[PDB]
């Protein structure tokens, strides 16, 4: 519910941000100081994954065939291959996240930016409804940010 809320909220600004290049600069929900933490984190962790994946990225995209608001709204495989030993870890949801901020620069760039946020509720919802019990135990995004201090 809130745990929803806030992670939405993280995943929807990093990809529209990703996409566009814009900071969307509008305030945030009520927990305001953890997602504003976590975006920061994923700024630096998830452009890595990015960059370091961009061949594999390429290769899942094409394979996907991701194109308007449908197949938008249907990343599972994605959730097989980043969980396909069954194992959870922050790793693994930075790199879910980074592959959606991928997904959402190519959306921009076939003009089809409209698929966004749809983009970011299906990767919450498919995040949120499995892994909720391993969230919650893990503090959230807290422990994210946390995990990721440096
Ligand atoms: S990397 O080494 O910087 O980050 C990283 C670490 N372990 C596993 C992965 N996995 C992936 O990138 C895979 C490959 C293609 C793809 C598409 C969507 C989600 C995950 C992945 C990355």
């Given at each position: 519910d809130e745990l929803y809320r806030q992670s939405l909220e993280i995943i929807s600004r990093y990809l529209r941000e990703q996409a566009t290049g814009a900071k969307d600069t509008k305030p945030m929900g009520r927990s305001g100081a953890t997602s504003r933490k976590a975006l920061e984190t994923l700024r630096r962790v998830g452009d890595g994954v990015?960059?370091?994946?961009?061949?594999?990225?390429?290769?899942?995209?094409?394979?996907?065939?991701?194109?308007?608001?449908?197949?938008v709204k249907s990343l599972s495989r994605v959730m097989i291959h980043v969980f396909s030993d069954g194992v959870t870890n922050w790793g693994r949801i930075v790199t879910l996240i980074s592959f959606g901020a991928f997904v959402a620069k190519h959306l921009k760039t076939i003009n089809q930016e409209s698929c966004i946020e749809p983009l970011a509720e299906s990767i919450t919802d498919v995040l949120v409804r499995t892994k909720r019990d391993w969230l919650v135990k893990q503090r959230g995004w807290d422990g994210f940010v946390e995990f990721f201090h440096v």
């Open positions: 990015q960059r370091n994946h961009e061949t594999a990225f390429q290769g899942m995209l094409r394979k996907l065939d991701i194109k308007n608001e449908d197949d």
